[PDB]
Symmetry: C2
Subunit: 176 residues, 2 copies
């Protein structure tokens, strides 16, 4: 109940800083200072800003975790919520997307944890009860369309609304 | 001119060779101009960056493939065959895949045109293969979804969070989920 408080303050600081100044504002020194932790402690829990941002994203997803007749409607509702959230936080989205661009093997765990989460959130959105294999697969496809189009967005070759459009199109092609 | 097409051809040939042999890092303007036997300035003129070079070369590749028979009986089979071939080519050339992947991740606004152009080529290929002729709008959309799956999983592979095998499997999965028959 003490390491939990530390992790809490740390991911809090991470989220606030990323929200206020984007990826470039997320420095280990800055986060450590804002979270009132030893820098070494921060590095001991999160070896980089990628780990920080991805863990933060994960926590936010698990918190979002805690509406429709057909799987199409329920999933479109889920995608709609997350999409609204994305558009409501441009700089945070920049931070997360950049984090996923720079995420390598060293962040594997932290990334996997997010996958399992968001995929589950999609799968369980589609399924009445335990989700099927195909529904998990569909979730992963959704996430991939999301990430690719976010890659276009980050480099200013597409807008957030373009991302939204592509996602809706994908949902419809998959389970429409 | 006619010499224009020749210059461009040698340039993209050099791009392909260098990228395939030494990956993204190897593709430097002076090296390409050197191997292609052109002036650095004319290179910079026709292709402003290594992103332009790589994306343009990929475009030409898909143009050639589209140019040059037992074919699939369904959209699913034809697209599965297509993706299959491209996938084997991908596994046979990890460094070329690395160069192209980095090219598309690092592609910015100043290349936004070229990207889109090649985006139209690739997709069209897929779409036409699905239709075995004039594609529907939805088949173009499916082409784009396939490309997105490809790019994301290549982003995973690039950063050693996934294998080439995983990329291939994800593509097969996407194909079946989208037009399985």
């Amino acid at each position: 109940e003490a390491q939990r408080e530390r992790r809490k303050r740390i991911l809090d600081a991470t989220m606030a800083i990323a929200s206020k100044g984007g990826y470039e504002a997320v420095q280990m020194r800055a986060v450590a200072d804002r979270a009132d932790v030893a820098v070494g402690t921060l590095y001991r829990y999160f070896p980089s800003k990628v780990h920080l941002l991805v863990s933060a994203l994960g926590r936010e997803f698990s918190r979002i975790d805690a509406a429709g007749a057909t799987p199409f409607q329920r999933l479109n509702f889920m995608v709609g919520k997350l999409n609204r959230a994305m558009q409501r936080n441009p700089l945070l989205t920049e931070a997360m997307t950049r984090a996923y661009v720079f995420a390598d093997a060293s962040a594997a765990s932290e990334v996997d944890q997010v996958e399992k989460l968001i995929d589950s959130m999609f799968a369980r959105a589609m399924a009445n009860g335990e989700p099927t294999e195909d529904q998990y697969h569909i979730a992963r496809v959704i996430s991939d369309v999301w990430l690719s189009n976010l890659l276009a967005w980050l480099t200013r070759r597409a807008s957030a609304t373009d991302v939204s459009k592509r996602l809706d199109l994908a949902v419809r092609l998959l389970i429409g």
